[model samples]
Target: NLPPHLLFTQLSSQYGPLFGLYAGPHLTLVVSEIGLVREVLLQRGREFAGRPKMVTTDLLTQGGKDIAFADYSPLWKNHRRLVHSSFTLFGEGSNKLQTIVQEAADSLCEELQACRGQSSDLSVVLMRAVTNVICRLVFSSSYQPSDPELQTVIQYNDGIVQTIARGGLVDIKDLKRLKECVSIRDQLLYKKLLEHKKSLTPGEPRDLLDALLIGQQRGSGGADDITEDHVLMTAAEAFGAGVETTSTTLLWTIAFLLHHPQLQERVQAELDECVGVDRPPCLSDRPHLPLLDAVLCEVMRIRPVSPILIPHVAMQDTSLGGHSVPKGTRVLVNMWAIHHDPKHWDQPEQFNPERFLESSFLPFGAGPRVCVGESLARIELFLFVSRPLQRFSFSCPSLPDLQGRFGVVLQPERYTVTVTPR
Candidate 1:
């Protein structure tokens, strides 16, 4: 709704690095500096932790049971803590999940390589790749490349994506359509949760169901009163947030590489020297490949998926950088604005991984409220970013409209690229 401020950089330049924003009565204070973000999200997050109610998100989340949608409360805190365990099975005996990511990345590179001359939506391969890893780790089993049950997984995410992407809440014209999508999506999510409960037994539990199992034991979760609908909507919110956002980020990274072949070559040289084609890269190698690490972080900054962070609710009356706001102010942290600020990043619109390599930039967000999938997202991103560059030189075609289209995520309105094999 702000002009000349489509990106975070514009806002930062106009409003200073740290300033307040008013989003439909909500007040938010955004800081482009890493030091400040760390202070707020890590040190003082609880004071600013609650999520503001979104008319559309509430409709789909069924009044916010899923951790991501839940405001900062016993419910949100307990659920968040219990949920990350499986993903953190980072090394050692838990390496199966890590392998799942590597395999998916390999398949993704190969699929794109195989379709070099074709003109496909790319979403097909993108969704399948992300769902495979999430399914294996989130569900007791993620999903096989050819599993008949895969359609259900697709159905789950697509329903939610289609719902949120309908239109902006401020847009009255799309309000009716948004409500319809929200209803259907919630109904589908509830059905899946019911079906999952039917298959559960006391002896064994895994994935999210297991997380909830443990949460209940910890006295943080609902008891028998915790109906199927409660966890179902939450599951849909978590899965949709983690799945589509990460997948779209990977796609955008690929799109950027396609636009800049030189950067791709530099990354490939690093991989060839440090990692080679022998064994794929891992998190440990991240410290070594400065260029690859830079590109991944930079790519996210260049085109953040959640341009406007999930609106935060100010629970108490407070002054942010001298701006006075009352309780329940809908705080819209201009992440897209903070990330793209020229004062913070050189040539803000340009994609220069070296900037991130040299300076600090946050795309995952800040604080305890930072993205829960930060580590897991990094692992998958390293794989996806590395594999695509290692295998071929990706680029955009002539006469292209390289514009960002925002749905639940931001994507190229038209991405016809060449995966020019080296």
Candidate 2:
């Protein structure tokens, strides 16, 4: 069965870009064209900033306590602010985030070197490296490649991702498995929360957990508000989102590289010219490597992890593309359709990085609800992609299946590649 994004894209071809349908007794508006998309997500963003209640997400986020699927409210606004400030504390105008990503990139490169010339599936290794980076950021700890705890985290996360149903519908069987996975995830995250609380310093924060702990203490809300559950959910979300999206994007980049060796070579050539092999590519070298940046952009364009972004609901009476959308109507922005629209792109389905040189894109959604991890993802993607290209060339036994398996994220199917040192 096709995913909703693909189904909606097909429906748009017949019914036009802006159309409405009943999704389980709820009126859901699907916006495939860019103009209406901007209208919903930007021009009248606040009017459509609310998130709908879904069975699976309520379980994952503990009834919308986390930022991504949380409904728009004063408390949601405050929670987002707390998380945004915490991210800024580590992300902007500081080399700490860059250094952390660099270490992970270096470790990944070393691991790849060990498997040079052998065909292997890189998803696990890439996941481990990305997971470690998020782990260090979230809880101030890193894992060895063989750590049992890391394996447990990976298994539970994979279980949740695979079992979580899309589009608000959940089967009885999936609900049972999803509950077990969520239970394991909660136990692990709760243990981390307890450890952080025991060692928390008031003014000096070691990681995001410490930052959240400090914020919880000083929050302007009533003493009962911004509870410990909120902090735990936020930390778990940071870990889940950071690892899942970035790692999948990296895998897509590698899969694309295998398909287009010349493009890969050009990216490597640009890296070599701008950043010599004497040192690994870092945040400073980002400006000098346009091709590498374009490649990453193109990969995101072709295979966005969140193709149809988490659906937004109309908070109040509003209008979209000249039609009135009543309050409480659900809106789905078909970004997959938008990114591949023929009006804006030369060859909509073709994989060409050069198109990014002069075009506008929103791999990360825009306006008030734009991804909070945009800055962090960009830095990590640049380093992870460039560092690997600097040292090796990737080739596969056979070209990867690029259609991707759609889930909570659009993920590349498993494929093995030979990593050749350059």
Candidate 3:
């Protein structure tokens, strides 16, 4: 598959960091420099807050109803507020969310241990683990490894994501399949929302689902009620957006660590000395694990999940880096180029976490519309990466395919590794 992000970045150097291309009939601006990107997404954020209108985007995000692809408007603003409040609530006092993360992290370590030094597809296992964690958070439940429903969800979502990353173009067959996936997603999310409603407790929220429902109920008679679709859309968006990127980034991190065993050894030593091998890593221990943090940062820098963010549309005529950009122009923030550009980074190709100590990065994104689930995703990354290293060392007889493919997101090809007990 042609890596379009790399292609666009190459174009940027020839045509300046700010260049324009056509996505069908639309003019899409690709920005690689931080200053110009800051101009569009920060200083001029409001004008660039809008999302591009596309058939594939509309199909996947329910005609711009979901936050990830929604157009900027009052409705989008209210939905974002509600979603943000729910995330904040969960982050603040939910022992259940932490318990879910811990359980999933522990389960993953145990699964790897059961492999007993046999080479296994770490990416596959990691995806399942991430799927479960996201499932529990969004639906208040997780599925068994062999659950048919789980596979259905995974396959359909993967289908849509692959099409998205490919080119945001879908044929008749895939369009039908996309609709089917959305139908299943809505049914499942609504079913869970119903269950939560049936068992609602007064003045108490058990999980994110409950919090969403309460918010929906309270908004019933206000300017607008967080309708059934709103609840379903937000919950499904959270689940879908969280799983793939987290899983992909973790896979890349592990693959990199396998190649650089010295770095792996150092991280392991840091974990053992600080948290000790007697117990697993936790969020509380994250602050003291700068080396572990740096490794993850470096991995992300080399292999960012979304090399180009979901494109934003200009709400009004705006100028960026002395280039005239008209209203309705689609903007693609080329994070891949910026992270790898030698001007901002020294030896950008190297996997050195120490560089992060002296550099600035925005892997999640930046400004008013940065990812809403940034906090949860970071927590997931830290626990998922650190906990496993606390229990095992990963290696392979032969290096796996490190080529990254873009499909709804950028991810490494599936690879296997031997997991030896520490």
Candidate 4:
């Protein structure tokens, strides 16, 4: 129902910078320029910082029990505090998550080599890599990936991501139509979560699941140390947010790299010099490779995963650009417009890494709302792209013509990349 990302670029060029879409009986303002996007998200973030009160969010999240999907409140505050503290313990500066990223990258390299010089959907390859990393860290030692049954959990969770977001009837204003379809996916996930919880072996933990289980033991007042509700909800967040996002970004990286072989070769050279073929690239080597960082940054700028990030609701009346936004009005940050906006960038459509070195272009949103995992995402990009580029050369089979589609997320349909061996 939404224009694909590049078509967004095409449409913006045809239309003016800011256009409005009649989505769900409301005029959702779409911005194609950074100035307007900044005007809304940063300068007036407080006014537009709230979340849409969708039934799926409420039901799937156990009536706002899930923190991130909830509207801004003490719940979001406390949950964000807990998650921030949790991540910081293993976060980039500490280098724990970075190391895990390297391990995940190692596994993924093996997986990709299986498809080297062959046509395969790179999306599925990346989805598994990112999913495994999150599982390894969150559950820690308690996570048993060998449990063949666990594959079903991952599969169901992955399917639910596309179903819940891309599924139709999201715009249905009624809770009944909303709750039924939404509940189906959530129930399946919840059932698997319950079974997983009951199987927890004391004194052994897998990943973040272990952390949450241990958290429950500390007066968590749940049957299995952690509430089935919280675990299920967090799993939903991890699998959904982790899988498609990293996959899309990685696919886009290959697509752009195909267009610029020198950049790919350069990244390979850097990886070879820093990590060597014997050892995979690690977080420790990240700082030593600026070009790798720039390449990842440029990939994000070109095909930002959430080109139109979730629409924030105004809890109270506010004014933006001197226009009154009444309380209850939803605010969208229009990333598609901002990233492509010629005003904030030069030759914005061109995929150039120099911009990261030259100017500030944050594809990740700003402020506390900035994706909490930006640093980890950076490590993943560096690991996946550098290793693959070092091992194999890539180019598109042919130039692909695609249209940008915006929904809960953004995607370029009919896009394909052709990776040729060196």
Predictions in order: lDDT: 0.65, 0.83, 0.78, 0.63
lDDT (10s digit) by residue, model 4, range 1-422: 54544455567777765555565555455555666667666777666667766666776677655545666665455455555555655664366677777676766667667776676667666666666677666544223334444455456555455456656423323445545545654675556555556777645433455445454445444332334466556655665566677777776777677668788888788877887777766667778888888888877877778766767666678765556767776655656666777767789788788787743366778754667556556666777777677666776666544334543455555455665545
Q: On lDDT, who's better, 2 or 3?
A: 2
Q: How does candidate 1 fare on TM-score?
A: 0.82
TM-score order of candidates, top first = 2, 3, 1, 4
Please, what are the lDDT tens digits per residue for candidate 2 over residues 251-370? Answer: 899999999998888988898888988797878777788878888888898887877877788999999988898999888888888888887888979999998775337898987798
**Compared with the true structure, what per-residue lDDT tens digits does model 1 show for residues 27-139?**
55555544455445555566667775667657656777666666776656656665566346542335555677787887777787778776545767878888877765555
For each of the candidates, give the backbone clash count.
Answer: 14, 0, 1, 22
Candidate 4 regions with alpha-carbon error over 4 angstroms: 1-27, 93-96, 141-150, 165-206, 212-228, 358-360, 400-408, 412-422
TM-score of 2: 0.94
Write down the worst ten-residue block by lDDT for model 2.
165-174
| Better model by lDDT: candidate 2 vs candidate 4 | 2
Worst 10 residues of 1 by lDDT: 220-229
Per-candidate TM-scores read: 0.82, 0.94, 0.94, 0.80
- Clashing pairs for predicted structure model 2, backbone only: none
Q: Specify the highest-lDDT model's number.
A: 2
**Reference-based TM-score, model 3:** 0.94
